[PDB]
Amino acid sequence: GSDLGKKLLEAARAGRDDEVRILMANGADVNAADVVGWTPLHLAAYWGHLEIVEVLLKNGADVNAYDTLGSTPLHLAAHFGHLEIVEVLLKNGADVNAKDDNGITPLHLAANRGHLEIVEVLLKYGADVNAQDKFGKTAFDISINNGNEDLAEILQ
Amino acid sequence: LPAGATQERTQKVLNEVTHYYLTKEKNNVESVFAVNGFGFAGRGQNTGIAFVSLKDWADRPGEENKVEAITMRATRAFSQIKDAMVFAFNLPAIVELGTATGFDFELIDQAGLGHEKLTQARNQLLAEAAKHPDMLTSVRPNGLEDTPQFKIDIDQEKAQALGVSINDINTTLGAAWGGSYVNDFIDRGRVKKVYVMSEAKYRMLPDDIGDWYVRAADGQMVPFSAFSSSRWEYGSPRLERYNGLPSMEILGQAAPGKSTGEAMELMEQLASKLPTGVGYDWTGMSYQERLSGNQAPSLYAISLIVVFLCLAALYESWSIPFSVMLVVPLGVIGALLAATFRGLTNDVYFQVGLLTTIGLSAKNAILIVEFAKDLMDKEGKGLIEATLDAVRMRLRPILMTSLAFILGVMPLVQNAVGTGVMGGMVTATVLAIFFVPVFFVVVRRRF
Amino acid sequence: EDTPQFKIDIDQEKAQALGVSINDINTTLGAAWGGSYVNDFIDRGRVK
Amino acid sequence: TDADIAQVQVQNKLQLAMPLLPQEVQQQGVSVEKSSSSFLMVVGVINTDGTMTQEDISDYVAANMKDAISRTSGVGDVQLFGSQYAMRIWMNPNELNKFQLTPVDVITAIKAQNAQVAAGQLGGTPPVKGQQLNASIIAQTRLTSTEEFGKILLKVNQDGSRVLLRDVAKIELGGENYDIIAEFNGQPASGLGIKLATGANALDTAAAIRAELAKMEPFFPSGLKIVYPYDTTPFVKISI
Amino acid sequence: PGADAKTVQDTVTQVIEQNMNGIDNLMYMSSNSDSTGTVQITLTFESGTDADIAQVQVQNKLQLAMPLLPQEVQQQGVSVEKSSSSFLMVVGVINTDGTMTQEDISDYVAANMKDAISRTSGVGDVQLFGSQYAMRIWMNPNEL
Amino acid sequence: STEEFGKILLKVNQDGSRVLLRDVAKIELGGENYDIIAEFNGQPASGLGIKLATGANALDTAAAIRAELAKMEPFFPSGLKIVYPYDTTPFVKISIHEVVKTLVEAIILVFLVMYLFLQNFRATLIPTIAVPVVLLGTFAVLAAFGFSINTLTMFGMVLAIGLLVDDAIVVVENVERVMAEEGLPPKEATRKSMGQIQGALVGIAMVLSAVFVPMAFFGGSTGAIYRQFSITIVSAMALS
Amino acid sequence: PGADAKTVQDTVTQVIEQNMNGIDNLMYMSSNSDSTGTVQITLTFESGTDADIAQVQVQNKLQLAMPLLPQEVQQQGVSVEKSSSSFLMVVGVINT
């Protein structure tokens, strides 16, 4: 990360749209890593800042950048129920079958926290429903363990 | 230092801070007590304080070598530092109280909103406070921000399948990585603790988690990676509470010219526009100085009523008292000019200083009026005759005390404070010898 | 005033014979019919 | 007798007896209180909407009101006319016997999987040379919902099926005890029975309780009202 | 030992806070729970309150709430002190020749110096900056 | 010892060979925690934060602490040195030093100004007697009320000396004046002189009490500070 | 319980004694640790001292040591109460 790159991470995390827009003008590194490997896109996706997600992708931010444990921004967006950020990320060419170091996809995370609409959008963009984690558990297996019959109907 | 900043990094800043003070302030600084690990906003590897001990008052001559001056120079040189937010500040006059200027605001989660929602309600108040520089300044949170942490989930099914108890897993993890206090031993006739913990180089990065083995019921040694799965998430490294409920302490002060009372009234208005289930309360000095304000007018009121009543019994008159009591501003104005000109501040010493000047100028006036009134009562003299005889008889002793004072104060002419009570008594004497005669005649003519 | 109360006796020989623990018998009885305070959990931010 | 001293002496002696008491009795919390035998006032709490049950009102009073009133200076003892919620596991002995389980196995599983672990830190002190990052390790936290208690894994069968806690018990929030049920003029209520601390003023304490309730009123749920069904202080104020 | 801010708050801070009841002349009660595995609960009292009575009342309600805390916290134990960091002076102890770590200095001060300063005439309270020695077992997972 | 902990038996293998704690772990004496790294001018450091006992003397305790550290000198290991990064003793000395200066300084100047105007050494001693008598008197009233010798009581006592000088001059000057303008003997001149001012001086005591006493009836931190100046000045002035 | 004078003194008596610094009107402090396991630290206060406040101030300072004491010593419980050295009377009981 650069001197500006640090201020973009803090600004992207915070939700200050105006500060990001000026840092985009001043040529701040859009692919500036955290200590754990989170780009500004990760931080925006996690804390749910639609404005900054769109502005960062516009300035050639890596949509399939992964942290030290292999988690993409689509994981963070899907996991924490940020619907329109999952839409924007998938539209700008996010890997819907992105496996972290545990073999967990965005479909697994979305299924587990029970965000029904995100699961449908992920499936629409071609999410692998048969995909397994390191333990050998599908998105369907997560739904029956949680007892989510609404979710269980979809995943088949 | 920022989130995920190590102890080795925090020391390098403290090294450069200590290097500056013993180099560029070798004339002023005696020692630097560098404490990596502790902070007055929070604790951790990423925080430190440097307690700077200075030399004698004598070895630091002039205002350029005082704390206020060194503080401003220090902060400028530390603005250069890359991955740090370093700044010097003077200790408060009374260490027991604390900062003792501005306000202390507690933002309270009143309806189980959670940590992440109170974080935003705070950020909404901080953003609003920034849009009134004319009223509020230095409105900041007195606590640590959320940091990355290493979430690790134990697959209960996988652990039961391989025949590994959760007790053994959590203990192996907590004891190795966290450190575990086992029992006490006796080192040379003194009781001391025994801690088991991982050797540093096997408990640093997530790669090291895979190197830890828990024994199963069947006898097999199961690695930690077989039944674990880890990811990153953001959690608070310092949670605050106030009167049982979750809170966030906000510090600030009134903008230059504005009173601290006004600043609090705006903070109350801004707070009432926050999301539902977000309350607030005033703690510390704000709690103290709000208790002071209510009492002030009541005690001012009692002072004057008792003064008036005591003079009324003395002189046997409801009106004549006023002739004495009108002397208050004459004693006050001298001190105010002396303060404003040389550039002193209205502090608690200066205030008791005014009360003594008012007290002594009142003392001088009480005798002038007493002598004047007695001449009219006993010897049946006229108003102007009695006033002129009174002020003559009382001229010497007033000038004797006033000469003793200005001779007593002028050794200070340390030079700044030397004109404070000097100027306060000069005008108090000069005015009162001319104005008290006026007050007595004006009052006795009217009433 | 005194009231009827269901007296229950545990045959120690028959317990030892079958290999059932005495603590298992008393916990099972105490927990089911009386109630067992196991540990604490977090109900919307508060310890319960 | 100085009541503050009398409490310190009584508790000094109790502290010797505390470890001799059963393990279960200590965990329920032994309380030493100085107060009047009767009530200063009752603070009734009703829901005018009907969007809250008698169980719900008592739980809210316990979690969001009682503690602050209990802390108020002059309040000797506070009595909740109801009960705070607890994670109630209602065991089914038919289902327990079906999978060869006991209340012991249910108690072991809850202690294991409703755990708040202290897992340490990445790059913790003392660290190695050229250490990169410093981050808290978060293992297992306390369970938050009835659904999470639901999916507590009791055992795994030979064929590969899983026995959950929801399979052998009905899991819900509900009173720590179900003994006390309050009703204000027929309609259901909870409330605080407040006893005046030994020597403390009745009127001054009443004012301090009202002051603390006034700070809560703004943050109440929908149609939650305070009512004053018993108050001794108004007589004292008016008679004087 | 090795507890996160949330673990400390959920198991220790909230439990002690909930039991701080029937204590006379209390104004407010602030508390911090941080990732060093530490909690501090400051009970500030009305002016003119007997600080001895105020402390023993706080001390007493903690003792009855001690069985409710975790095993590791009960083992470590919990301290109750009057809050006035108005020190008469701070005596620094240093090593110039570099033969001693801060661990070695603190232990010497604790063993020899501290107890003597405590018994000195007109000394109300003494506080060691650092801890005395502890038997450290540094485990090796490859050997285990 | 570390040797004893090293020889702790973990296991006995099939063949009879042993596994000890030292075989699977490094063992040494170290700190309870390694969170803090204390340094004093880039050198390893610790310290002792010392607090003053209730009703103790800050000067005596300070000197006594330095005496005890001086007798530990010959038992210290090589390299160990005492340093004093913080000390409140310096400020206590000065607060006392200024009061002793202002008293000495005042008695000298009053003697000069009394002689410059009245022009006889007999009259110059009467202030020199009265001012010490009242100040010593003030210390007795501070002790009775249960105050200490601190910055606030001493810089309040400095302001009091100003009021004491007036009461001394006001009485003597008026006797010297009555003697000059009527030619009366010292005794009858005093009786007439006191007859003129005695009612006023009593009046002034009440008026200055009205100014300074209500200051002490503030609440909390401010009230505590205001009490120090208030009781010192009103006591000193009332004794005068 | 079942600890020699030395072990009792090193783990309990010294730990308690070294926190009994700076208590109001404390004249002297006699203590003893015996082979049965008992500790008896007696703090004698200046004549005229309020014995109830004296007790409170000792109990406050004792709670500094309480955490540092052995686990078994805490299990037996530690008493803090006003004492007297001599028996007023002895009341004997026999069987005839």
Ligand SMILES: CCCCCCCCCCCCCC
């Ligand atoms: C005759 C007036 C006496 C009043 C007594 C109180 C004086 C001290 C109060 C100062 C308040 C000033 C706030 C800026």
Ligand SMILES: CCCCCCCCCCCCCC
């Ligand atoms: C620690 C407190 C000690 C109190 C000292 C009081 C001494 C009083 C002697 C002077 C009495 C004068 C009465 C007018």
Ligand SMILES: CCCCCCCCCCCCCC
């Ligand atoms: C409330 C007390 C008032 C103080 C003033 C008293 C002065 C009275 C003077 C009377 C002159 C005659 C003396 C015998």
Ligand SMILES: CCCCCCCC
């Ligand atoms: C309390 C002041 C009374 C003034 C009355 C005046 C009588 C003419």
